[PDB]
Amino acid sequence: SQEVMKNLSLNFGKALDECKKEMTLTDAINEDFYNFWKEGYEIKNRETGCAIMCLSTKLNMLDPEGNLHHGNAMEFAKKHGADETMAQQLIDIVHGCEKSTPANDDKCIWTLGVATCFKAEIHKLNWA
Numbered sequence: 756s757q758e759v760m761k762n763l764s765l766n767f768g769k770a771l772d773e774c775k776k777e778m779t780l781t782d783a784i785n786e787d788f789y790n791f792w793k794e795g796y797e798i799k800n801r802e803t804g805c806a807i808m809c810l811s812t813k814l815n816m817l818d819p820e821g822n823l824h825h826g827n828a829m830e831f832a833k834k835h836g837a838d839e840t841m842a843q844q845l846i847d848i849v850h851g852c853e854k855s856t857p858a859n860d861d862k863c864i865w866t867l868g869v870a871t872c873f874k875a876e877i878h879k880l881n882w883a
Contacts, residue, residue, distance in 0.1 A: 759836035760882045766835060767810055774809035791874065792883045804867025811866070823853055848876045
């Protein structure tokens with residue numbers, strides 16, 4: 756289902772401008788979020804990584820552990836209209852990159868990769 760998925764990404768990217776002012780993030784992340792659904796775009800602004808992570812915080816997707824509130828991530832999905840196997844898929848992929856995807860200590864870099872693997876799955880699922 757793409758219909759709801761647009762709403763998820765939409766309502767995810769609400770608090771972005773707050774995070775921009777907070778963390779000094781450039782306008783160049785609008786571009787990533789606008790062109791994210793291209794057929795061979797590659798995401799190399801580390802700031803989009805950190806913007807995503809700030810949005811994830813603001814949408815309350817972090818447990819006390821910092822290992823993703825997969826619990827609340829599923830609420831977000833069903834809250835926006837998501838199917839069951841859908842909401843499970845987004846967690847299984849996300850949970851399935853939060854550690855599998857290597858990065859440095861750089862949590863911006865980290866979350867950038869977690870989004871970038873996950874993106875490709877959304878393409879395979881034809882959710883774009």
